[PDB]
Assembly symmetry: D3
Homo-oligomer: 237 residues x 6
C-alpha cells in the first residue's frame, strides 16, 4: 500500500487504463470489464480490476493535471509492478479539421509544465509514448473501424490560461489535442523504466466553442475505451 493507494501488490494488473475522472474509471469497469472489483477508494480516486476477453486489466482515475497523475503513475509502477499505463482522457482541439468526439493518439506530448526540465537539467526532453503501444492503438482502431490521428498533444498546467496567444502556436505546430497529463505521465514512465501512452477523445473545441457535457465525458466516450482495451490485447503477442 502506497501513500495514495490503499491496495496490495497483485491488486492491480500489469496494465492500467487511467482517465482523469475516477467516475469514468468506474464506468469503464462496469461496462467494459468483467467481474471488476474496486481495489482503491482513497481520495475518491476509484481504481478497479477485472478482466477483458479473459485478460486481467485494471482501470483507475489519476486526477487532473500533471502533478496528480505523476503521483499515481509512479506508485503503480514502483509499488504495484505495473508495466503499461494507458491514459484514456479528454482533450480540447485547436485545429479546424479536428472535430468533436474525435480520437487522437499522442505519440508525443508537449507541455508548459516545468517537471521534465527538472528531470532533464533544464533541457528539452521530448516526452514520447512507447512506440509499440502507439502502433497497438492504431491497429486496434483500424480493426474497430474508428478514425484516429497520431501526433502531438499539449499537456498544460493551466486549464484557464492567461495566454490565449499560445493556442495559435499549438495549432501552427499541429497539436492535435490540448490536455493536462500526457507529458507528465510520459516523463514518469521514462524515469522509472515503464511504458505509457495517451488516447484522448475531443470533448471540446477551443476555436468554435463546441462542447460535450460533464456527463457525456463520463459515460459516452466509448470509442476511446475499446481502442485502448483492444490495444492491450494486441500488445500481448
Amino acid at each position: 500500500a502506497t501513500p495514495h493507494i490503499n491496495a496490495e501488490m497483485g491488486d492491480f494488473a500489469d496494465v492500467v487504463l487511467m482517465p482523469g475522472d475516477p467516475l469514468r474509471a468506474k464506468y469503464i469497469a462496469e461496462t467494459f470489464l468483467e467481474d471488476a472489483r474496486e481495489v482503491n477508494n482513497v481520495r475518491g480516486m476509484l481504481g478497479f480490476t477485472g478482466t477483458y476477453k479473459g485478460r486481467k486489466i485494471s482501470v483507475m482515475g489519476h486526477g487532473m493535471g500533471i502533478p496528480s497523475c505523476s503521483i499515481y503513475t509512479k506508485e503503480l509502477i514502483t509499488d504495484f509492478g505495473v508495466k503499461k499505463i494507458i491514459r484514456v482522457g479528454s482533450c480540447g482541439a485547436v485545429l479546424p479539421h479536428v472535430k468533436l468526439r474525435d480520437v487522437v493518439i499522442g505519440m508525443g506530448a508537449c507541455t508548459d509544465s516545468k517537471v521534465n526540465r527538472i528531470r532533464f537539467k533544464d533541457h528539452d526532453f521530448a516526452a514520447i509514448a512507447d512506440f509499440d503501444m502507439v502502433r497497438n492503438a492504431v491497429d486496434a482502431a483500424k480493426a474497430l473501424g474508428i478514425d484516429a490521428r497520431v501526433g502531438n498533444l499539449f499537456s498544460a498546467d493551466l486549464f484557464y490560461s492567461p495566454d490565449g496567444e499560445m493556442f495559435d502556436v499549438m495549432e501552427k505546430y499541429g497539436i492535435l489535442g490540448v490536455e493536462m497529463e500526457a507529458a507528465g505521465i510520459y516523463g514518469v514512465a521514462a524515469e522509472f523504466g515503464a511504458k505509457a501512452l495517451t488516447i484522448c477523445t475531443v470533448s471540446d473545441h477551443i476555436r468554435t466553442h463546441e462542447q460535450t457535457t460533464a456527463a457525456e465525458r463520463q459515460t459516452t466516450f466509448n470509442d476511446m475505451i475499446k481502442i485502448a482495451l483492444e490495444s492491450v490485447l494486441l500488445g500481448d503477442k
Copy 2:
C-alpha cells in the same frame, strides 16, 4: 455549471474551505457544518454547502496539485462568485524545530511550478495569501489556544522529486511546510481579484521520517478546520 462543477450560482457560499481530499470535505460537512447539501460531485470532487454558527460556508475538494486546484478555485470565483478561499491541507516538515501536528499558516508560498512565471512574464511573483485572512487565522487559533507559525510554504509539482538536495535548500530558507497547492491557489486569487489562504497540518516530518496515526491524525485536522472556520467569523465582524 462548468465541466468540473455541476452547480449553479448561489449553490456555494462566498467562502469555501478546500481540502485536497474530497472525502475530507465530506467529513467536514458532516462534522462541522449544519444542514449541508451536496452542491457538487462531478469527477468525485465532493462539495457541500451548510452553515457554521449561522454563517453560510461551503467545503469542497480541489484535488492534488497546482493544475488541479487552479481549475476549481478559478471557477468558484468567476462562475460562483466566491470571495474567500481557505485551503486546509497537510504538509511535510523540513525544519527540526517544526514539530508533528503543528499548524502552519502560509502568508507566502514557494514553488518549483512554472504557472506564475507564465502569468508574470517569467519574473518572480510572490504567491502570497490575503493579509486579513492570515490575521483572521492567527487570532482564531490564539482564541482556541493553538500555536500557529506564519511563514513560507512550498508548493511542489513532483511529490516524488528527483532532486533530494532541494529539501536542504527549503530548510535553509525557513520553509515551514511542504505541499502541492498553495502557490497556485494564491496565483489564481491574484489573477481574478479574490482572496486566498492556506493552512496546513504537519502530517509527516521529512527529516525524522515520522507519520500521523489515524486517531491523532483526524484530531488535528479538526483543529485546523475549526481555526479556518472561526477565522471566517472574525473577518466577518
Copy 3:
C-alpha cells in the same frame, strides 16, 4: 568592521531603519531620535544609532538597488547582530484604486531580479516579510489613524525600464507598489535568519504620470517614519 561599514559589534541596535538615501537617514537620526551618534560614514552611507522613547534604535541608508541594500543588510545581520530590518521608501502605483500618498506594506515582494533564483535553485521563492513586523506596522499606523494596504510590492532592477508592457502585468496581479529593494532584503533576511519589512509611500502613478508635491512626499515620509518606529515598540511588547 566590514569593507562597507566602519563600525564594531554593539554600534548598531538590534533593529535598523533603512531609507535608500543616507541623507534621509541623517534626517531621521536628528529629528526622530535622541542622542543619535554616527556609527558609519563609509562610501557616504550614513549610519546612526540613538534612542526612540527609550528604545535603542539605528538608522542607515542602504543605497539604490537590490545588490546595494543586500550588501548592507547582510553585513548588519552577520557582523553586527541585527535582528530586525525595516526598509522605508517611496513607490509607484499601477492599480487604479491605489492612490498617491497611500502607505503600502509589502508582506510580499515580487522582482525581475535573479538573486533569489540563484538562492532557491532557480525555483520560485516567495520573498516575504516577517508576519509580526507586518502586523506591528499595521497596528502602529492604525493608532496614528492611517489606513494601510498590505500586499505585494515589485522590486525592479531597472528604474528606467525598457519593458513598459510589464506594468500591465503588475496591475493584473495586484502589485500595490513599485520600488527597488524589498525582494532583495527579504531574500537576505531568509538566507541569514533575520526578519525584515518594507513600508512604502505611493509617491506617483506610473501611468497617469501624476506625482505628489515636494511638501507631500516629505509629510507622508515622516508618517512612514512614525509608523516604523512605533511598530518597533509593539514588537518589543
Copy 4:
C-alpha cells in the same frame, strides 16, 4: 534557386534522404541510386537525384548541427516541394545495450538547443517525427532482417560538452543515440507542415570508447540506407 541550393523546382524528389556528410550523400547516390545526377554543389553540400526501384529519390547532406540542417530542410520544404525528409546520420550510444553499428529510429528528439523554445514561446515542444514514416522504417527493417530500436534521440548543440554528467541523465531516460540534428529537423518539419524522420547508425560508444573511422561512417553505414529507401516505398502505398 535558394540562398544555399543552386537548383530549380523539380530537381528534388518529393522525398529526400539527408546525412550530415555530403560525401555520404555521394556514396548513397552512387551505390543505391540509378541515373543519379548531382543537383547541388553549393558550399560543397552535395545533393543528388536518381531512382530506387522506380521511385524517384534525392539525397543531400545537411551539414552538422541544428542550425545547418535547419537551413537546408527549410529551403527544401518551402522552395522545392519536399514532403518527406529522412535524416540518415551517425550517433553515439550511452546505453550499454546499444552497441556499435546498431540502427536506431528516433520517434522523438531531445535537445539542449534553444531553437524550439524560441518557436514555442519558451515551452516544451515534443520534437517528434511522422508516425507513418516511423512505422515505415520499422516495417522495412523487419523485412530486411535488421534489428532497430525505436525511441528518443538527443540533438546536441555541443559535440564536445563541458557537462559530462549530462550523459548519465540521457542514459537514465533511455536516449538511444546522441546526435545533433533530429530535434531541429522535426522543428522545421512541424513549423512548415512537412513530414520527417531520423535514422542513425551508432558510430561510436560514449562509455566503452568503441568507435568507427571517418571512412567507415562515410561508406559502410548501409543498413541505415536500405531501411530508409524501403520505407519510402512502403509509405507510397
Copy 5:
C-alpha cells in the same frame, strides 16, 4: 534636473569618470582636477566638474550594484549630454596568474544579472565597451609603465554569493576581474547610444582572500585614475 542628480545641462563634461564610492570621486576631484566644483550631492552621491591638463572633465560616484549605476549612467547620457563614461573601481581575482595591484580593462563584461536579458529579449547580449576607449586606456597605461590586462569582467549582483562554485566557472573561462557594475553600465551605453569603459585594479584574490595593503591601495588607485584621465586625452585626438 533629475530625482537622483541636482544639476542642469552644462554642469557635467561630456566625459565622466565614475567610481562607486562618492568619497573616491571627491578624492579624484581634489588631487587630479583643477578648479573643481561640486555639481551634485544628492543622496550623498558626490559629483564634481573641473579640468585636467586643459580638458573639461567630470567625476562622480555611481553607487554599488548594476541597478544603482544604471540610474546615474542613464541620466548622464539623456539629461546631461554625456558621451563617454569611464568607470574606475576595484575587482576580485579568480585566475592564479592574475596578481593584486594589476590593472584590468574589461572589453567585455559577464554578469548574473537579468537586466540585459530583459533588454535583449532573453537572449545573450555581449555587454561590451567602446573599442577606442579600450584602446585609449591600453595606450595610456603603456606610456605610464603599466601592463594592462584586457578581457572579460564579471558583474555580480551579490557581493556575498551563496554560489561558491561559480568562481571555478569564472576562472575556467578566463574572467580577469570580479566587480558589480561593468555589465550594467555597458547595457545602458548600448541602450541610450553612448560609449562606456570599465578599468579595475585587482584589490584582492577571491581564492586566498589576500588584500592589498592600505598602502598600495591609493598607490594603484592613483595609477588607475591617471590611466583613465590620460586615455580621455588620447581620445580627444
Copy 6:
C-alpha cells in the same frame, strides 16, 4: 586525427582562417597562400596549409552555425595546438548608417544560442574576441586604406527566424552585423584557452534590402582576407 579532421599535429599552422564555405577555403589557399597543400577533406570541409609572405598559415571551412564551427575550432585547438583562429564571413546589417561592403569586427558577439549559458551556469557570458587580435585587424585595415567597425555581432541559430521584431532589438542595441558563428567560436576560445576573432563583410542590408553582385561580392572578400592575413603578420611583431 579526429572523426572530422583527417590530419596530424603539425599539418595546421598555429593560426587558422575559417570561412563557413569550404569552397572559399580552397579559393583563399589558391590565391593568397604559396606552397599550399590540402590537409583535410572529411565531410567535404576542405582545409589547407601554406605560407603567406613566408608566414605559415592555414585556412579551412567551419560549416554553418555555432554547433558546426564549435566542433572544428575545438579540435583545431586541443588536437592540433592552434593558437589563433580568425573567422572570415559575411553578415547582414540592421543599422542604417552601416553600409554594404563594410568591414565589421566583433570584439563581442551576441547570440540566441544556449551554448554559453550551458558553459556559464546559465548566466550571461560576454562572448568576446582577443583584444590584441582585434587591434591587429583594425591596424592592418588602416594600412589597407580600409575603415573597419569594431562592435557587436549577432550569432543566430535560425537563418530563418520566426521572430521579426528581433532585428529592431539588434538595431536598438547597436549590433553591427548579423551572422551565425562568432559567439560560438568565442565560447570555445574561452573554454580551451585560445584566441579567436571574427571579421565580417556586410553582404546584405536587412533594412534597405540590398545584396552583393558577384562582381563586388568577391572584391570585398579579398579585402577581408587581405586584412586577416596582414593582421596575423602584425600579431607576430
